[PDB]
């Protein structure tokens, strides 16, 4: 599981 | 360059069919011949501008992941010789990468920030250049490293300083700003507990500050607000 | 050109660095410079161009699907006049898939075809240079039109003829060109009987041929058929 | 749903 940035 | 002879409107709705057809990169070199016609940016098109490049160095970042992991697989004790041309395949990527990144902080540089007076294009702005300079930083191995990612986290610090005086709590750019800012404490600068208290600290203040908001003001600062949570759960 | 100075193993070699990471392009980039050294290819060479390119074009294609049904509405009654840069857009991303195709018909031109003495490399290349042809043919709108489609029907007769003779009924490439080849049918000449017979007989020879193979071509042999079957349940 | 051509 990636961690989240700001994307769509 | 080679969009100076097309009109500003044009390249903005030519960007807006590129990500309908998702051709990124056409996106982006029409919102660059955008920005370079030197008006300021809507915040529709600050969108554009963001999405486009976020989009292109995206791709670039997950081929520049596969190509890492195999190289240093390759440099495991016990695996054959294949000569350079991992390195150099990887190199041609991170440079290309590297090209690309520059391009969005030298339209930062000349002359976006410089223009922005408002709290949210500057702090949306300063939020890139941080970005930028991560995206630079996870490819970076050499005497500038430090330098790199001390001018992510001076360019987000800048946009935290402002977000804080300047807009609520539930503000999307602001709670986009704190998610990329922890992701860089977590991954770029080894802080792991900074990054969870940012991004604890801004939920919780998020949180608190929904029942002021429209049922669509709601929709999207929950929507970051779970990116948040997503990383905390990971992280903890 | 550009690839002239890299070895062609290392350009082999990149092409498939280039496959793990999705870039397409460059893996495309990278196969052009392995045919351009003159050397025929192998069948895993063959897999790796046909694979790169129509991953590049395919791309092309659907971004072009999007535009040309944003054009055709645009042109409806009723429909408000935005000015050129539709049609403008969507030139441009014709165009560019036009460059690819020619190149690929170049390549194939000069001088795969003509080196290629086995069925199976012969098949191949012909299969691609009426996919090519094909995919030329989808976009065009003028008066070379029928000439570009009885390029790409008599590329893909010769194919199968020479598959029909020297290969059998399960082979993965004389299935694939017999599925292409009844795409083209349906969707280009105007000849969906010709298309959905075509499929059927296809399949039927194929399934009385499984008995053959071993469990590994079974599994390759029936990837195929269920395309032929998902056309014919789609158009019947 | 679109029609199937030699792809992956
Ligand atoms: C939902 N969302 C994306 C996930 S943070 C956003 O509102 C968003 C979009 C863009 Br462009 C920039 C920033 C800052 C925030
Ligand atoms: C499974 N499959 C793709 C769907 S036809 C194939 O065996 C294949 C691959 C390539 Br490259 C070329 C040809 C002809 C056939
Ligand atoms: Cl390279
Ligand atoms: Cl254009
Ligand atoms: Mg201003
Ligand atoms: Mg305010
Ligand atoms: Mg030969
Ligand atoms: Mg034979």
Known sequence: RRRKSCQA | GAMGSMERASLIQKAKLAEQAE???????????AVEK?????????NLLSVAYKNVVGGQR????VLSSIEQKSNEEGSEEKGPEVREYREKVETE????????????????????????????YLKMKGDYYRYLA???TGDDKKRIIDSA???????MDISKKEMPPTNPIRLGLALNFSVFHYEIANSPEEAI??????????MADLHTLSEDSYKDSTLIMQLLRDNLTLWT
């Open chain 2, 38 to 46: 030197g008006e300021e940016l809507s915040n529709e098109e600050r």
């Open chain 2, 138 to 140: 996870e490819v970076a």
């Open chain 2, 97 to 124: 990468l590297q090209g690309v990144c520059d391009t969005v902080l030298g339209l930062l540089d000349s002359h976006l920030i410089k223009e922005a007076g408002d709290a949210e294009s500057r702090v949306f």
């Open chain 2, 23 to 33: 051709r990124y990169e056409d996106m982006a070199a029409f919102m660059k011949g």
């Open chain 2, 153 to 159: 986290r001076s360019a987000y610090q800048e946009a």
């Open chain 2, 197 to 206: 208290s940012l991004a604890k600290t801004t939920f919780d203040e998020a």
């Open chain 2, 62 to 65: 997950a081929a520049w992941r």
